[PDB]
Design an enzyme around this catalytic site. Structure first.
Site, mmCIF file in Angstrom:
data_model
loop_
_atom_site.group_PDB
_atom_site.id
_atom_site.type_symbol
_atom_site.label_atom_id
_atom_site.label_comp_id
_atom_site.label_asym_id
_atom_site.label_seq_id
_atom_site.Cartn_x
_atom_site.Cartn_y
_atom_site.Cartn_z
ATOM 1 N N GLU A 147 0.832 -1.194 0.000
ATOM 2 C CA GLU A 147 0.000 0.000 0.000
ATOM 3 C C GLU A 147 0.871 1.250 0.000
ATOM 4 O OE1 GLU A 147 -1.203 0.895 3.865
ATOM 5 O OE2 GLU A 147 -2.933 2.130 3.320
ATOM 6 N N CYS A 175 -4.561 -2.490 3.333
ATOM 7 C CA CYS A 175 -4.145 -2.338 4.722
ATOM 8 C C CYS A 175 -5.164 -2.865 5.720
ATOM 9 C CB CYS A 175 -3.856 -0.875 5.030
ATOM 10 S SG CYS A 175 -2.805 -0.664 6.473
#
Lengths: 307, 304
Positions: free
Chosen positions: B47, B171
């Site tokens: 991410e 995430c």
């Protein structure tokens, strides 16, 4: 440290068809008295703790009421309720319920929650009925739960009991994330789950630790991802040639295993569970009101399959 | 019936504020070329893999736009797309998105999925934004994702790509069961999750790594899907990021796991047909699920 509740996991051994109901209740009372000696305030009993796992046998949809309970309590289970009220201990008991509602006779897979004063707190009826409804010779063992029980009509309820929020689930409910999340959205702090998990005969090696891995994986994750205590009590052993999975566990809000069974018979696991340990995750990492976006969860309540 | 894909978990090392965007892309191409030498057909990037994890720093809501991407791809990221197309390798890349939707500027935490032919197949924007929106001096470090990003408007999408059903999450999406189930109800077979998890709370390293894998192994098993978790680890300007990149089978088993906190590529052969085996063996959603008892999941946001 603060809001501590001592919980006992009264794992049961194999119940056979040759075992009478008094021999079964006496095994329940024996586990209850051990929990009282060790200072427990709540002992959790497995699913269908008052009879052998009869969904493995084939019979007419009405010809299995001999394993059901006329009332709760009745003449055979009253000695268990009297011992719990006298020793000042609450309990959750799984049984096959036979009730008269709307004229017709209804049958549910049911767990009842009793308070330390002997007063019935609540009553959850099984929602996810596993197995099948008709005879299927393609399986080595039958699992006719859909033939002998109806879908429960209580929902995943959460009650005010034992100084906190206590919810109940039954067996294969623990494999669905919706079971924990529905009660987690009711600010649950303690989920009581009794289960009967069939298992292959010569299951050993890596395939044995895999099913035990999946057994604990669903409960540890449901505990952490909802910041709640989870207690899974099994009825293990070999019931008339059919082996049942053991591994009773008490899971912390961090998903950690704090107590685990070591036998496959009548065993009592006990851990000191601080209910206030559920509050930290509910205010930061798992603050539902601050993080959840229900506008993207609509598939969970709209469709049943995949499409 | 022959749907086998070799997936490479391209875990990234630390990215400093002083690192140039060219330095970051070259590290992405280096990991992309490691996957090609290992025969990988798909690599997963963490991410926000195009900048340092800036949500830790406090600034104006317009201040962090320097780390955002004007386009995807743009002149700075085009060399990465051209190398992936030249090697015939698809990839999923996380970045900070700046799109402009209707006269106004919008900011999203976004991952883009690219096919082996260089064609973009989809785009997921982060839904569960963690942390807070205002400076809180009680914490050891800040985590202002709510201040710099908006809740995505794409939803948990599942595309037809790489020979199966591929979805993406970002995430802390992996902490919520709704992330896996929504895609699981779309017959998903492969979930790609890049993440940035700090080691300290607000430490408990072993317990945080435990929660990191527990949520992904359970989401993979309870939905009978492959789950790829790729991290950007290392010490970023005094702030340590957790590693532990991992590739999970539909059984919840870990078939590949990262061992360092820097640039590291984990690769495993993932047969998407394994999903159909466990989806058919008493994990049938259409058979056991009773959606009439799950209404609280969509009726309310918090506890009643």
């Amino acid at each position: 440290m603060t809001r501590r509740i001592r919980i006992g996991g009264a794992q049961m051994g194999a119940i056979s068809r040759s075992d009478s109901k008094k021999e079964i209740v006496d095994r329940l009372i024996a586990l209850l008295r051990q929990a009282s000696e060790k200072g427990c305030e709540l002992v959790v009993f497995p699913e269908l703790a008052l009879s052998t796992f009869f969904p493995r046998w084939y019979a007419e949809r009405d010809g299995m009421d001999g394993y059901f309970e006329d009332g709760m309590p009745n003449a055979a289970t009253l000695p268990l309720f009297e011992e719990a009220r006298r020793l000042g201990i609450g309990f959750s008991l799984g049984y096959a319920e036979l009730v008269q509602e709307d004229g017709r006779v209804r049958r549910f897979n049911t767990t009842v929650l009793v308070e330390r004063n002997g007063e019935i707190v609540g009553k959850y009826r099984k929602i996810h009925l596993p197995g099948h409804a008709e005879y299927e010779p393609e399986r080595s063992h039958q699992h006719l739960e859909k033939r002998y029980f109806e879908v429960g009509n209580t929902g995943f309820q959460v009650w005010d009991a034992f100084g906190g929020r206590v919810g109940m689930a039954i067996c294969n409910d623990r494999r669905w994330v919706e079971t924990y999340r529905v009660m987690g959205l009711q600010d649950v702090e303690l989920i009581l789950i009794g289960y009967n998990t069939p298992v292959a005969d010569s299951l050993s090696g890596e395939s044995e630790t895999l099913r035990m891995f999946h057994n604990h994986l669903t409960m540890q994750a449901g505990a952490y991802q909802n910041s709640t205590w989870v207690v899974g009590v099994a009825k293990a052993g070999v019931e008339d040639g059919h082996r049942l999975m053991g591994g009773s566990v008490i899971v912390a809000p961090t998903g950690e295993i704090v107590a685990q069974a070591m036998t496959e018979g009548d065993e009592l696991i006990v851990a000191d569970c601080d209910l206030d340990r559920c509050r930290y995750y509910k205010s930061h990492i798992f603050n539902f009101a601050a993080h959840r976006r229900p506008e993207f969860y609509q598939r969970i309540t709209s469709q049943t399959g995949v499409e």
